[PDB]
Design an enzyme around this catalytic site. Structure first.
Site, PDB file in Angstrom:
ATOM      1  N   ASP A  16       0.759  -1.244  -0.057  1.00 30.04           N
ATOM      2  CA  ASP A  16       0.037  -0.085  -0.034  1.00 30.04           C
ATOM      3  C   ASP A  16       0.830   1.108  -0.099  1.00 30.04           C
ATOM      4  O   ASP A  16       2.140   1.339   0.319  1.00 30.04           O
ATOM      5  CB  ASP A  16      -0.855   0.191   1.061  1.00 30.04           C
ATOM      6  CG  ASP A  16      -2.241   0.372   0.909  1.00 30.04           C
ATOM      7  OD1 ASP A  16      -2.501   1.404  -0.134  1.00 30.04           O
ATOM      8  OD2 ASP A  16      -3.321   0.195   1.538  1.00 30.04           O
TER       9      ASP A  16
ATOM     10  N   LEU B 106      -0.432  -5.325   4.836  1.00 30.12           N
ATOM     11  CA  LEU B 106      -0.160  -4.080   5.706  1.00 30.12           C
ATOM     12  C   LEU B 106      -1.114  -3.191   5.205  1.00 30.12           C
ATOM     13  O   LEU B 106      -1.817  -3.157   4.271  1.00 30.12           O
ATOM     14  CB  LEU B 106       1.303  -3.335   5.717  1.00 30.12           C
ATOM     15  CG  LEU B 106       1.592  -3.023   4.131  1.00 30.12           C
ATOM     16  CD1 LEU B 106       1.310  -1.482   3.876  1.00 30.12           C
ATOM     17  CD2 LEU B 106       3.264  -3.200   4.004  1.00 30.12           C
ATOM     18  N   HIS B 107      -1.690  -2.357   6.062  1.00 27.48           N
ATOM     19  CA  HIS B 107      -2.645  -1.386   6.121  1.00 27.48           C
ATOM     20  C   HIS B 107      -2.554  -0.283   7.207  1.00 27.48           C
ATOM     21  O   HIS B 107      -2.374  -0.483   8.302  1.00 27.48           O
ATOM     22  CB  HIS B 107      -4.036  -1.958   6.103  1.00 27.48           C
ATOM     23  CG  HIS B 107      -5.105  -1.370   5.914  1.00 27.48           C
ATOM     24  ND1 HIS B 107      -5.623  -1.493   4.292  1.00 27.48           N
ATOM     25  CD2 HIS B 107      -6.099  -0.331   6.425  1.00 27.48           C
ATOM     26  CE1 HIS B 107      -6.598  -0.868   4.066  1.00 27.48           C
ATOM     27  NE2 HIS B 107      -7.049  -0.011   5.323  1.00 27.48           N
TER      28      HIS B 107
ATOM     29  N   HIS C 186       2.874 -14.424   9.042  1.00 24.52           N
ATOM     30  CA  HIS C 186       2.920 -15.833   8.892  1.00 24.52           C
ATOM     31  C   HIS C 186       3.647 -16.908   9.589  1.00 24.52           C
ATOM     32  O   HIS C 186       3.862 -17.974   9.729  1.00 24.52           O
ATOM     33  CB  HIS C 186       2.581 -16.539   7.328  1.00 24.52           C
ATOM     34  CG  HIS C 186       1.513 -15.810   6.722  1.00 24.52           C
ATOM     35  ND1 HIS C 186       1.353 -15.862   5.258  1.00 24.52           N
ATOM     36  CD2 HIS C 186       0.304 -15.330   7.124  1.00 24.52           C
ATOM     37  CE1 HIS C 186       0.179 -15.329   4.792  1.00 24.52           C
ATOM     38  NE2 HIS C 186      -0.358 -14.935   6.019  1.00 24.52           N
TER      39      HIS C 186
END
Length: 308
Positions: free
Chosen positions: A231, A272-273, A286
């Site tokens: 992002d 991701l954010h 993970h």
């Protein structure tokens, strides 16, 4: 030599199989997906809401269609309604309500082809949803993934409700993001091709209209994996989870090589954010099937769901 930063990561929650799809909705609630949960030996993935103070998980949706369970894998929040668009590797594009009800958006694309399972999606500011599909055909077809063979596809779900296949022949297309002009017009589509360590770009000429396909960037490392979720920050730097590398890569707006790397305390960042109107990035991973947050240098790029 690429500069590296090593910020403090704080654990948010844990025990989430395949933790991915971090997203904030219009009320600031935080969600992730658990794609790899199974029941009776078959897929039964989940969409979860996370209490940010305690890390407590609440199952929002456990999507299943005609007895085939979902593998929910990546999310975006809509603007005009507080609903999540969820790329599902068995079911395709879902629209999920916060009350747990959901709909499968399309079983076939605009040319009448069966839909492929989807992994990541990104809204442009016009409300079109650009989607990667590294899986083969949706349920009820057997589950397959384009890890070694080039059958991954790219879609655009337009505001007119058309599901248009805009490219194909990708080897495991993964993260996707829209670079906008300063005036808000969509400008470039960026697509991760995970095992080939490539980021691809197209010029966006309109809804479902892309041209000028070129290699945009290169992902470091030879590890198994590569670019996963990605992002933009508010300067149009592209942050890319490099699954297996222990780093998030930072690209400048024109791509090429990373101009900085972010070292993670885990090997396998998956997505991701940003938290809206903050510098806080939420990262799924993970290695521990967990979610973390850290502070970036500046705020995230405004998401479609924050526009008016």
């Amino acid at each position: 030599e690429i500069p590296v930063i090593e910020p403090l990561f704080t654990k948010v929650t844990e025990d989430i199989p395949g933790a991915a799809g971090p997203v904030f909705d219009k009320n600031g609630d935080f969600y992730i997906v658990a794609p790899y949960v199974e029941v009776n030996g078959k897929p039964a993935g989940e969409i979860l809401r996370i209490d940010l103070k305690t890390g407590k998980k609440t199952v929002i949706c456990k999507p299943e269609v005609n007895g085939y369970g979902g593998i929910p894998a990546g999310c975006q929040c809509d603007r005009d309604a507080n609903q999540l668009f969820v790329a599902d590797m068995r079911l395709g594009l879902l629209v999920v309500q916060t009350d747990g009800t959901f709909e499968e958006i399309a079983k076939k694309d605009s040319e009448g082809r069966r839909m492929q399972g989807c992994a990541y999606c990104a809204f442009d500011y016009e409300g079109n949803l650009w989607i990667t599909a590294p899986a083969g055909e949706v349920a009820p077809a057997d589950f397959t993934i384009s890890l070694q063979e080039k059958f991954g596809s790219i879609y655009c779900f337009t505001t007119d409700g058309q599901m248009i296949q805009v490219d194909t022949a990708f080897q495991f297309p993964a993260g996707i993001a829209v670079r906008h002009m300063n005036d808000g017009r969509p400008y470039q589509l960026i697509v991760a091709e995970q095992p080939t360590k490539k980021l691809w770009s197209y010029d966006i000429k309109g809804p479902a209209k892309i041209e000028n396909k070129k290699v945009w960037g290169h992902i470091p490392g030879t590890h198994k994996g590569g670019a996963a979720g990605m992002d933009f920050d508010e300067d149009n730097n592209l942050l890319v989870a490099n699954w297996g590398s222990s780093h998030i890569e930072v690209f400048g707006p024109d791509g090429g090589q990373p101009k900085m790397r972010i070292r993670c305390p885990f090997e396998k960042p998956s997505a991701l954010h940003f938290k809206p109107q903050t510098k806080t990035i939420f990262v799924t991973e993970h290695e521990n099937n967990a979610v973390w947050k850290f502070e970036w240098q500046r705020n995230g790029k405004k998401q479609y769901c924050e526009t008016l």
